[PDB]
Nucleic acid binder design. Structure first.
Ligand SMILES: [Mg+2]
Ligand SMILES: [Mg+2]
Ligand SMILES: [Mg+2]
Ligand SMILES: [Mg+2]
Ligand SMILES: [Mg+2]
Ligand SMILES: [Mg+2]
Ligand SMILES: [Mg+2]
Ligand SMILES: [Mg+2]
Ligand SMILES: [Mg+2]
Ligand SMILES: [Mg+2]
Ligand SMILES: [Mg+2]
Ligand SMILES: [Mg+2]
Ligand SMILES: [Mg+2]
Ligand SMILES: [Mg+2]
Ligand SMILES: [Mg+2]
Ligand SMILES: [Mg+2]
Ligand SMILES: [Mg+2]
Ligand SMILES: [Mg+2]
Ligand SMILES: [Mg+2]
Lengths: 175, 75, 187, 159, 168
RNA sequence: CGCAAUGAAGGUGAAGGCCGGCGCGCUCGCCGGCCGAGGUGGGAUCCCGAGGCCUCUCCAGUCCGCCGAGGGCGCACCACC
RNA sequence: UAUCCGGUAAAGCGAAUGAUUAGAGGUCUUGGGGCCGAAACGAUCUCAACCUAUUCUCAAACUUUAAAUGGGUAAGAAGCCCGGCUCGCUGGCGUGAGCCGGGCGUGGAAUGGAGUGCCUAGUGGGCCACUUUUGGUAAGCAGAACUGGCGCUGCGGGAUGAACCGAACGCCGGGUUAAGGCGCCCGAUGCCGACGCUCAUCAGACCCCAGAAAAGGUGUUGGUUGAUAUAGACAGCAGGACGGUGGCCAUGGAAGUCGGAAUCCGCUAAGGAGUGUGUAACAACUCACCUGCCGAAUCAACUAGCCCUGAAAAUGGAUGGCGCU
RNA sequence: GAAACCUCCCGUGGAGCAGAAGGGCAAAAGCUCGCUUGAUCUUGAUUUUCAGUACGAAUACAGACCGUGAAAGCGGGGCCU
RNA sequence: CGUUCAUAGCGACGUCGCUUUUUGAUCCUUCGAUGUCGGCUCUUCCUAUCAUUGUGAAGCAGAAUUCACCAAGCGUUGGAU
RNA sequence: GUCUACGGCCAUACCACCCUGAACGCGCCCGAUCUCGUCUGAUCUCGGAAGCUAAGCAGGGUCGGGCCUGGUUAGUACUUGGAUGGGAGACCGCCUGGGAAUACCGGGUGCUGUAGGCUU
């Protein structure tokens, strides 16, 4: 796995039928990935671990992108992880605040790279669950839960440093 | 002044320049190394095939006539 | 960059004859033309043979030419031979033949013509039959040359029957250690 | 540099399997090889007369000669750059019929059945084999019950 | 659920060069006629064929071509093998002359034989000289790594069509 | 030098078949006639060739091709007997 | 696609061989030493080997199992199916072989024109990388396997460079790429690039590669697990820390206190038969439970990111340089 | 008497098979008897080392002359390396 | 261990490192030759600091001291064999 | 239903103990004149047929051992191919395909060929 910005995918698949097992059970997952191609691969990786079931032994039935049903709501997402350290493998519960699951998992993948130099292929996302104002354990999230939120944008450092590469005016950063 | 002692390093390559050809199969291989007592007897059998020729030729003519009668009955 | 071996890209067959003689080269000019413009593959085979070496176009003996035309059905035909026709002193009665050859030896010439045979040159064969129709294309035995008796699995290599290059045959030229059982071993 | 001895390294190869020592049971001996039978060589420890060399164990080849209680058998042995078809005189006990050929003969027999019939009918039938084609279009009924969700399980250290 | 058919046919582009390449790979790559880098071929899929692609995975990018892909490849870079001389399919007199003994008498017929993988696929596909495509405009992601893991190699199924457009 | 070998040597030295008859046809011995370098598989090439394929008409109909299913003689060379 | 071959990885040792831990059980045997016995398979232990279930941990020269990769064959005209002849072999009759004479055609995928013979030079110092691998503390050491390199070979990248990555060269125009990049040196970010992390009085800055470890750090950032607290805590200051009791072993002195077996009750609001200081030994001091004030979170133990300590070499110096927050 | 000899039971070989080790071996390939000289004479073929040369060592036959066994058979040295 | 007290100073059984002023390994370079030990003489660098400056430590009362830090500016001698 | 003789495959067929066996068989059994052989008529050889299923043999039984076959162990261990992935190393993760072995828990516990009986 690598990235870009992910998309939730639904992928349901089954170990393909036999004489002995005529109508085998379907298994569904939530597989975040940049595209269906790697989605299906990622589906197979997770299933292999859990169930005696390989890409040869099975058929993916329905892979399909899943759309955030409330895009223009701001939400808080709890996300449970399973990363690999340099040392042992771990569990976490991260929390992000975003407009989407995909966005919230994407956000996670960047954080984990930042905070733990953890690369995609090491991380397992288990559950991603949207959450209330309460049931938010992280204070970095909790500070934005407030009705009359109010802050300034204090030392507003400029970009467009090469529109006028040279100029008479020393700039301004108070607004 | 010790050497390298043995290797097989570049050898597979060397072999496969010119193929590794399978051993050229013919029909009708020799009877060299076949159990002598056999070979005597098949030699003798071969000796006397010309004995019992006139019988054999007639038998084929009788067969050919039976084939010609069968094909006439079909048509 | 492409992967092909350029190893056997050049085919080594002859194109023209290596000889510089002018009469043969005229035959080549004639049979090139016929080869290309006729459908006859006879012309192609003949053309191919005009480029070959002396070794490679061995002499065809009169007796060999007899018996090959004695064969059932190729009767009232013409035998063709890009090599030379030689005599056989060990044949007597010579049927009346039709023959093409680049050469025929003076004896072989007499014997054939005395029989009522016709001899043809290759320019004459073309006018007579430009598509090689009604011909028997023969060849001399390629592996006649004493040369070949030294070729093969080497002498002193079990089950080879390959003449060794020896200065002179005789009691004491080879035939010791490696042929007798009494002397070392044998192959 | 290793020893050139005939039996070097056949500690395991020529060794009767676990609880199959003792008498060479008799079918082995009393089954008939003709000329041109495809036959796979497999040396055996109990019988040491007529043993093949360790190089021809595993190797399959054709029978060329049949003596009283052995079978001459041409087998191809590779040597660095050249494959040498060579003829070895194995005692029966080290030899089975190779089934490899029989599945072929079964198929040709089946073809001769399917060629005789389907001639008077007119409908020509697929005689050639064909590799496993891609697995066709089909429906899967999630009959009533929905799909089963699979969360990956949280790590824990067992040992 | 409607699980549609697994694909019949796939385009296979050789996406790395001709130096330091294992002998088993190299042989298969010259059984797909993928000698130069960025040559491509159509390839009918089946247990035999797919596994040959499995043995050359980090040497190729491949997958399931569109209809449009089969057209664009055939019209823009459609070259016959005609007396062993790579010759551009300028007219149907060329296709017919060679493939007309199969009922294939024009560029259009050819496209239908390639795309539906007909009876006469082997003979229409071999007739086509392997497609010399240019370099990938806009570049690649990574030559050496698999598609799934960010790179370009291996099966990318639907997405082989994007690559086709930026190379054809 | 080549056209004959093989044996250490004394020496010996490359034909067979068939048919009919006479000796018991004894897969052995002797007398008359005929063929005369054996046979299997593959073999470039020649040869024969059903049959098309038309001709400005309906049939007759020699001439000329083009192809040719099928079948033959089979060089060289190879493998086998 | 069928079909044989295998004894390496792994696994196993309540299966063999060999190794090896522990207790249960057993006068198996018997002993050697005991203690209580004159002595007694008497009682009681014990250690020896042996055994009955278990149990710990192993094997290049062990193994019941047993992969992956791997090596044979086979996938048709030299094949099938009929008819008849030959044999000095074989034989109750029949085998089996060899001959004639007919009858039947694409027999898995993909690719490619094949076969065959003669003359024949140079070479016979090698080395390097992935992976496997023997010797060795190790080596830019020595020795094998496997493929691919270098040698014979330029070109883009890796500042520099046999061998790394990319790619393999007729002589040129246009286009596009790879691997690598895009402050300036130096072609390209002079993007209003996105999200974090990190300040280093030794910062850090890209395969091969040219450099650091154990162990530490309320430095900062994430986790994990447990707490706690309105029965208003947590620290921050202030009040007590006893008696049954020189408790028992230890006397050389330990009444809580060199050590060790202990190790509970009372009063209780509550104080350990005691954290230390210190005493020859006490004493004296010091270290819960609770309040008074203050006013919301507090605190512990792990864990992993960057940063830091750990961190010493000789001409002046090298993320390539300039520099960069 | 821990060990002498006898007898009953259990005993997959934990013994033995000249020697190193590995394989193989139980109405045997072990032990004990009886009879023996196949450790004899003679062509080629093949395997193993291999260059696919030699040597040695071996394998299957074939022709003699024997051995042994009621016989089928086995035996031309040592169960195999 | 240091009366007492693991750590003022020490430090077993274990363990992780650096160094190339020891000696080995190794044999890459040089055998159409790179002058092979020591001393003298002279310059420069390193610090792993003996003294000297500034300081933390003690089982530092003073004196004497060892332990550590910044630190290589300046020194580090005369003789007998 | 089942046996005997000669078998094929060789434990689903072995071992232990327990029960039951009609008829025909198979046995044990009773003898040593002769054949044959022993220290010994135990074995071996031979001539029998009074007893008896006690034993062998068969069929069954046992929360039996063993063997055979499934599950689990486990997509775990291992592993083909890949990367300018990680990691100071040791090693590890991913991609691409392949994929075991105990303990533990189930089920099974001879099939059958030729020739001849018996249950008429
Ligand atoms: Mg050498
Ligand atoms: Mg070249
Ligand atoms: Mg690479
Ligand atoms: Mg081994
Ligand atoms: Mg192991
Ligand atoms: Mg040299
Ligand atoms: Mg060296
Ligand atoms: Mg050189
Ligand atoms: Mg490369
Ligand atoms: Mg013996
Ligand atoms: Mg004999
Ligand atoms: Mg002390
Ligand atoms: Mg040195
Ligand atoms: Mg000098
Ligand atoms: Mg210092
Ligand atoms: Mg008796
Ligand atoms: Mg009974
Ligand atoms: Mg009973
Ligand atoms: Mg049981």
């Amino acid at each position: 796995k690598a990235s870009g910005t992910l998309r939730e995918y639904k992928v349901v698949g089954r170990c393909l039928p036999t004489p002995k097992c005529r109508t085998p059970p379907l298994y569904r997952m939530r597989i975040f990935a940049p595209n269906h191609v790697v989605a299906k691969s990622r589906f197979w990786y997770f299933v292999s671990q859990l169930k005696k079931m390989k890409k040869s032994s099975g058929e993916i039935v329905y892979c399909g992108q899943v759309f955030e049903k409330s895009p223009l709501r701001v939400k808080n997402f709890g996300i449970w992880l399973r990363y690999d350290s340099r040392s042992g493998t771990h569990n976490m519960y991260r929390e992000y605040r975003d407009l989407t699951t995909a966005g919230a998992v994407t956000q996670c993948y960047r954080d984990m790279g930042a905070r733990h130099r953890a690369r995609a292929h090491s991380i397992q996302i288990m559950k991603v669950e949207e959450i209330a104002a309460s049931k938010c354990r992280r204070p970095a999230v909790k500070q934005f839960h407030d009705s009359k939120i109010k802050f300034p944008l204090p030392h507003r450092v400029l970009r467009r440093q090469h529109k006028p590469r040279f100029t008479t005016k020393r700039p301004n950063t108070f607004f | 002044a010790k050497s390298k002692n043995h290797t097989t390093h570049n050898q597979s390559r060397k072999w496969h320049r010119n193929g590794i050809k399978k051993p050229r199969s013919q029909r009708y291989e020799s009877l060299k190394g076949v159990d002598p007592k056999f070979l005597r007897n098949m030699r003798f059998a071969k000796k006397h095939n010309k004995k019992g020729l006139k019988k054999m030729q007639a038998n084929n003519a009788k067969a050919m006539a039976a084939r010609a009668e069968a094909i006439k009955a079909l048509v | 960059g492409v992967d092909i071996r350029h190893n056997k890209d050049r085919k080594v067959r002859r194109k023209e004859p290596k000889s510089q003689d002018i009469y043969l080269r005229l035959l080549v000019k004639l049979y090139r033309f016929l080869a290309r413009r006729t459908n006859s593959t006879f012309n192609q085979v003949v053309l191919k043979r005009l480029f070959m070496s002396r070794t490679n176009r061995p002499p065809l003996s009169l007796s060999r030419m007899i018996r090959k035309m004695k064969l059932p059905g190729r009767e009232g035909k013409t035998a063709v031979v890009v090599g030379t026709i030689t005599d056989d002193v060990r044949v007597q009665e010579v049927p009346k033949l039709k023959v093409c050859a680049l050469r025929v030896s003076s004896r072989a010439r007499s014997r054939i013509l005395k029989a009522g045979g016709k001899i043809l040159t290759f320019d004459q064969l073309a006018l007579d039959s430009p598509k090689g129709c009604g011909t028997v294309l023969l060849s001399g035995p390629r592996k006649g040359r004493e040369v070949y008796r030294h070729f093969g699995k080497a002498p002193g290599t079990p089950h080879s029957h390959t003449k060794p290059y020896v200065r002179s045959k005789g009691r004491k030229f080879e035939r010791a250690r490696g042929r007798r059982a009494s002397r070392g071993y044998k192959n | 540099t290793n020893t050139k001895g005939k039996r070097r390294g056949t500690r395991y190869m020529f060794s009767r399997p676990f609880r199959k020592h003792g008498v060479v049971p008799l079918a082995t001996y009393m089954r008939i090889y003709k000329k041109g039978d495809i036959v796979d060589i497999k040396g055996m420890g109990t019988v040491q007369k007529g043993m093949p060399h360790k190089c021809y164990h595993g190797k399959t080849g054709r029978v060329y000669n049949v003596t009283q209680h052995a079978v001459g058998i041409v087998v191809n042995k590779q040597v660095k750059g050249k494959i040498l078809a060579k003829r070895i005189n194995v005692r029966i006990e080290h030899i089975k019929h190779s089934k490899s050929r029989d599945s072929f003969l079964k198929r040709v027999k089946e073809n001769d059945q399917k060629k005789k019939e389907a001639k008077e009918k007119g409908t020509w039938v697929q005689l050639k084999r064909q590799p496993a084609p891609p697995r066709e279009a089909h429906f899967v009924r999630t009959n009533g019950k929905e799909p089963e969700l699979l969360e990956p399980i949280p790590y824990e250290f067992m040992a | 659920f409607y699980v549609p058919a697994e694909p019949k046919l796939a385009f296979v582009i050789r996406i790395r060069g001709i130096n330091g390449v294992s002998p088993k790979v190299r042989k298969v790559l010259q059984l797909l006629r993928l000698r130069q880098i960025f040559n491509g071929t159509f390839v009918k899929l089946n247990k035999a064929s797919i596994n040959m692609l499995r043995i050359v995975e980090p040497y190729i990018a491949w997958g399931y071509p569109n209809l449009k892909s089969v057209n664009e490849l055939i019209y823009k870079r459609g070259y016959g093998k005609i007396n062993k001389k790579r010759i551009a399919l300028t007219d149907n007199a060329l296709i017919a002359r060679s493939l007309g003994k199969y009922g294939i008498i024009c560029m259009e017929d050819l496209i239908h034989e390639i795309y539906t993988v007909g009876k006469r696929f082997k003979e229409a596909n071999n007739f086509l000289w392997p497609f010399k495509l240019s370099s990938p405009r806009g570049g690649m992601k990574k030559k050496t790594t698999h598609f799934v893991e960010g790179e370009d190699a291996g099966n990318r199924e639907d997405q082989i069509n994007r690559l086709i457009r930026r190379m054809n």
